[PDB]
Amino acid sequence: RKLTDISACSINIFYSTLGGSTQKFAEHVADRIRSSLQTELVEILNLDYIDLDEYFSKGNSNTVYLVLLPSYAIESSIDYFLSALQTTIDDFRIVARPLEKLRGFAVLGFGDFEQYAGDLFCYQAIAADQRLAKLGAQRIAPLGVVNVKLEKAQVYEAMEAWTDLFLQYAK
């Protein structure tokens, strides 16, 4: 089986969304991974409605975490996700590197390169990528970033390319 080929027991796809698009993209990435690995062991999880302590201050051995995250320059629920990661990083009550037992992680960022070019472009996905590594999760693939101001056809090939690249790194 292909899941065992990537030394994983299952794949968790976390996302956050305000306008709904990242949720659709997460569903599409999930369906692509189900087909490629011919597995049903792929979960999609909305970061706003799960207990973050259950997934990011402790981790099921050999799980892959994919994190799909838009960035918002305004206050949003994504701020809470990032704050929760940092709190776990600094909290003496939690041992260091609690996610070292995972297979690993990879982050795919979505953002608006036309209005937020520069420091703000996919800045929260950048932060999430930095913080997951500090929690001890092995970075399986380098951070991906998608400019959603491209034509929608280009947005989908960008995320499908990233998904296929992740699966090759995961081998």
Ligand SMILES: Cc1cc2nc3c(=O)[nH]c(=O)nc-3n(C[C@H](O)[C@H](O)[C@H](O)COP(=O)(O)O)c2cc1C
């Ligand atoms: C109010 C607002 C602020 C945004 N700020 C950023 C930003 O700081 N950096 C970035 O890359 N994209 C930014 N964007 C673009 C969004 O991240 C992008 O539209 C994303 O696809 C939204 O995802 P969603 O539909 O799942 O909520 C912003 C969009 C809005 C509406």
Ligand SMILES: [Mg+2]
């Ligand atoms: Mg959300």
Ligand SMILES: [Mg+2]
């Ligand atoms: Mg998006």
Ligand SMILES: [Mg+2]
């Ligand atoms: Mg925000």
Ligand SMILES: [Mg+2]
């Ligand atoms: Mg982003």
Ligand SMILES: [Mg+2]
């Ligand atoms: Mg990454």
